From a paper:
For the ADP football (stage IV), we conclude with confidence, as a result of the high resolution and quality of our cryo-EM map, that the nucleotide-binding sites in all fourteen mHsp60 subunits in both symmetric halves of the football are occupied by ADP and Mg2+, with no evidence for the presence of γ phosphate or K+. The specific amino acid interactions with ADP and Mg2+ mirror those reported in the ADP-bound crystal mHsp60E321K–mHsp10 structure, except that in our map several water molecules are also visible. To this end, we built a refined structure model from a 3D reconstruction at 3.74 Å resolution determined without imposing any symmetry (C1 symmetry). The conformational analysis described above showed the unsymmetrized cryo-EM structure displays perfect symmetry, indicating that in solution the ADP-bound football does not display subunit conformational asymmetry. In contrast, the ADP football has lost the left interaction locus, and the double mHsp60 rings are held together solely by the S464 interaction. Concomitantly, the equatorial gap has increased to 4.6 Å with the buried surface area diminished, consistent with a football poised to split into its two halves. Further, when we superimposed the ADP:BeF3 and ADP football structures, we discern a subtle but distinct concerted pivot of the ADP equatorial domains away from the interface plane, abrogating the left locus and giving rise to the single point S464 interaction. While density for the complete GGM tail is not visible in our structures, in line with the fact that this region is predicted to be unstructured, we did observe extended density radiating into the center of the ring for the ADP football. From our cryo-EM images showing abundant ADP-bound football and half-football complexes, we postulated the former might represent a pre-split intermediate.
The group I mitochondrial chaperonin mHsp60 and its co-chaperonin mHsp10 assist the folding of mitochondrial-imported proteins, and correct misfolded polypeptides resulting from mitochondrial stress. Like GroEL, human mHsp60 can also assemble into stacked back-to-back double-heptameric rings capped by a dome-shaped heptameric mHsp10 (GroES in the case of E. coli) co-chaperonin lid to form ATP-driven nanocages for a substrate–protein to fold in confinement. Features shared by all three structures include mHsp60 protomers in an extended conformation along the molecular symmetry axis with clearly defined domains, namely an equatorial ATP-binding domain (residues 1–137, 411–526), an intermediate hinge domain (residues 138–191, 375–411), and an apical domain (residues 192–374). Each mHsp10 protomer adopts the canonical seven-strand β-barrel structure and exposes a flexible loop sequence of twenty residues (mobile loop) that mediates the interaction with helices H and I of the mHsp60 apical domains.
Author numbering:
A (entry chain K), D (entry chain L): 177 to 352
B (entry chain Y), C (entry chain Z), E (entry chain 1), F (entry chain 2): 3 to 102
The structure:
């Protein structure tokens, strides 16, 4: 329950996977609408630690541009260098990308990004004891989500092709 | 030794031009300018006559003009010719030659 | 002196390739990547023509191409050839040769 | 006596050797159950000071993998390097290990690790005036335990093959 | 110059092995390991061919293999051969020879 | 060059022994041990064969064994022979000779 603002009561059913965090740079808006970045059948790059340099970010964008699909970059943060590369590729010829930070303070995000990965199907990069790096990515290593909405304060992934037989195992893990 | 447009290096110096800036990537992506640093591959355009240190006869420079070379990282003086930046190194400092 | 793929080191420089990364151990365990440092054992692939310092005739490099050598720890420049990192040392800096 | 939470009274008999300290990395869980690492007929590596480098930790794991038995690593702490080696060996092919810090806080841990060693049968590494190092270990230098349970807050060793004729001498020492 | 087990130093380097660790004392007492440092007495096992600096002909190393020598304190590189630590010094750095 | 008890210095090194400790004074008083420093007067007992630096033929050491010399203050390595501390200097570092 929250303190509403209208005169009546309202039931809002937040559906899918939504977290209270929006895009970083206000240049990814391709909607011509109420300040939204809207993708369909997009890739997902889930990184635990920051994407600092132009080196680490280039292979994922290469894969995305080769396959010609949009890309969301859910990471701890996008440094100014990779951010500048992303914005540059966006404002000219038109690679479809968008970037967002992680959901939770320090420890919760390490689990929540893994949940997002297995819900969409992929691998979190930069994990402590997994030794997965951004430089060696592959098209089967990126998550796939049907529809993505990113406004200035919240991101929503809706349809993650994430192998439900394994998200069910995750659900059992978290319920136990 | 051979000269360039109204310029001639002294006793060892080699005047070279750095190669392209590498704006875009190999496959399909495109890069900014604050990154990418200074390219280490260059072409030699001016060569000093010969080495002062050599006793008696001068020891001529080994890198001949028109070659591609792998420059070092630090050593080098910025000269401007015709509003084009060229870099003067010493012949000992040039790492490798791209022979092919 | 002998060259490499469109590359040829200058006077004393020698271009070598570091050996394997040693991912797993001898017996049965397996190791991470942040550890294990840089392998000091390498193979020489490119050799400069001769030593500039030698008076008159050039003094040729002694480590010949195709040998295994125990590299030093610090000295060395990183070159990239065909998207493979090779390291250019000086011939004096190469510690030992794995003759066998 | 403790402040219970249920409506009735309860008698809880903590059996074996239990200390209020759980596993470090939440990747050692091989239970598919209530967040437990459960071993049977495991080795025990008791270290007084930290296990920092990959060098010191590798021979014990070599012995464990050769004999093909699980391993518990009770030490003052497991540094990030040895921790990463352990987690890497765990998440791939499947060496059975688990690590925990020491029970005591000061000198009491220096006594309690020795008690655990002689109760399971082995040698505490890093002792002040004993000159026992991790690099030179042997299969008779590791403790042996029948059953081990490690949850997120407490570790329990149950059956230590520790030469009861000597643990009795220890008991006489402590009673005196 | 003479080699060792699949190893050979270059131009001056000498591969020696430090002597025993001196665990116990002379009379009857025994010592720890954090003490006793690194023993300065060693035996030479590998010797480089000859000195690069010497003009024309190479100047061969003076310490011959199989000798005992009083090593210096600081200078020296750690090499590992057959899982045994050997130390590579320069021939100028070796203080004295235990001739007897 | 001449050797000592199972010891022989390398090219320029010279092995000397410092003189007495000067416990008491000249007239009638006596002194402590924390004072009086290290005596600078010594006797040469071991001498290296010759100077490596000399081109072609080796240049033999000038101070011959059995002489008294005024040692410098800083330079010198501590060697232990037969549980007696001897000091290895270089021949250039020895200040003067007590000829008489």
């Amino acid at each position: 329950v929250k303190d509403g603002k209208t005169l009546n009561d309202e039931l809002e059913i937040i559906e899918g996977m939504k977290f209270d965090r929006g895009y970083i740079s206000p240049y990814f808006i391709n909607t011509s609408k109420g300040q939204k970045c809207e993708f369909q059948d997009a890739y997902v790059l889930l990184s635990e630690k920051k994407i600092s340099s132009i080196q680490s970010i280039v292979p994922a964008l290469e894969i995305a541009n080769a396959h010609r699909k949009p890309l969301v970059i859910i990471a701890e943060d996008v440094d100014g260098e990779a951010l500048s590369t992303l914005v540059l590729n966006r404002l000219k010829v038109g690679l479809q990308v968008v970037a967002v930070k992680a959901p939770g303070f320090g420890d919760n995000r390490k689990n929540q990004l893994k949940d997002m990965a297995i819900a969409t199907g992929g691998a979190v990069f930069g994990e402590e004891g997994l030794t997965l790096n951004l430089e060696d990515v592959q098209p089967h290593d990126l998550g796939k989500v049907g529809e993505v909405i990113v406004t200035k304060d919240d991101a929503m992934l809706l349809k993650g092709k994430g192998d439900k037989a394994q998200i069910e195992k995750r659900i059992q893990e978290i319920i136990e | 030794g051979q000269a360039f447009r109204k310029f001639l290096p002294l006793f060892d110096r080699v005047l070279v031009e750095r190669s392209a800036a590498e704006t875009v990537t190999k496959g399909g992506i495109m890069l900014p300018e604050k990154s990418q640093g200074k390219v280490l591959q260059a072409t030699v355009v001016a060569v000093g006559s010969g080495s002062k240190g050599k006793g008696g006869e001068i020891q001529p420079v080994s890198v001949k003009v028109g070659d591609k070379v792998l420059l070092p990282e630090y050593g080098g003086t910025k000269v401007v010719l015709d509003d084009k930046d060229y870099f003067l190194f010493r012949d000992g400092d040039i790492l490798g030659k791209y022979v092919d």
